[PDB]
């Protein structure tokens, strides 16, 4: 597989496969493809085989660009990874030759995955919480300032919520890595202010 946002291992005999990915940040000019292989779910734990970066990505919002990464493996085992921009049609590729791990080193790696990947699943869940809140902050801010039509929301409630979101964004920058509960606590604290506004919008009948 390859590395996704938050150093996460996203897994992709003869077989060919593809997956669609987007940009982590707004007006991202390029995407770096990092190839990690191994039984353990974490990218960091797995050995990096090669890294290549696509460039010339058109400026666009965080989730808008569509990138297709196709991994082709034949009976020989030679890995051909190609990243293609759906919009532009611009692509980049690398080839990793099958010509050195030993049978017991592979079996040891597989055994390590069973024993340690249990703890990996917990780590993965913790990382996902970071991404979810990040996205939640962006979406709430966008909703409050998004629709010019959605100005109907009371000024007092909007001001109060905007400040809460702003405080969590600053907290997120300062605390690069935090506990799952801390992220959920922050999500819930924003959710506590925002949900009543939403109910009130649809409350009117």
């Amino acid at each position: 597989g390859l590395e996704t946002a938050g150093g996460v291992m996203t897994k992709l005999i003869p077989t060919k496969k593809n997956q669609i990915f987007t940009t982590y940040a707004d007006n991202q000019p390029g995407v770096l493809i990092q190839v990690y292989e191994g039984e353990r779910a974490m990218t960091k734990d797995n050995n990096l085989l090669g890294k290549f970066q696509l460039e010339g990505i058109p400026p666009a919002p965080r989730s808008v660009p569509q990138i297709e990464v196709t991994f082709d493996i034949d009976a020989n085992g030679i890995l051909n990874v190609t990243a293609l921009d759906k919009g532009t049609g611009k692509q980049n590729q690398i080839t990793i030759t099958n010509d050195r791990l030993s049978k017991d080193d592979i079996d040891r790696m597989v055994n390590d995955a069973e024993k340690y990947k249990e703890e990996d699943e917990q780590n993965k869940n913790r990382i996902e919480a970071r991404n979810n809140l990040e996205n939640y902050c962006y979406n709430v801010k966008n909703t409050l300032q998004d629709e010019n039509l959605k100005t109907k929301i009371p000024k007092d409630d909007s001001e109060k919520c905007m400040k809460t979101v702003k405080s969590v964004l600053d907290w997120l920058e300062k605390n690069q890595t935090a506990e799952t509960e801390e992220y959920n606590e922050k999500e819930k604290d924003i959710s506590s202010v925002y949900n009543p506004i939403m109910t009130k919008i649809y409350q009117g009948a």
């Binding site: 946002a5 990915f21 940009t23 982590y24 770096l32 965080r62």
Partner: peptide, 4 residues
């Protein structure tokens, strides 16, 4: 999501 993919990083730069």
């Amino acid at each position: 999501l993919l990083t730069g």
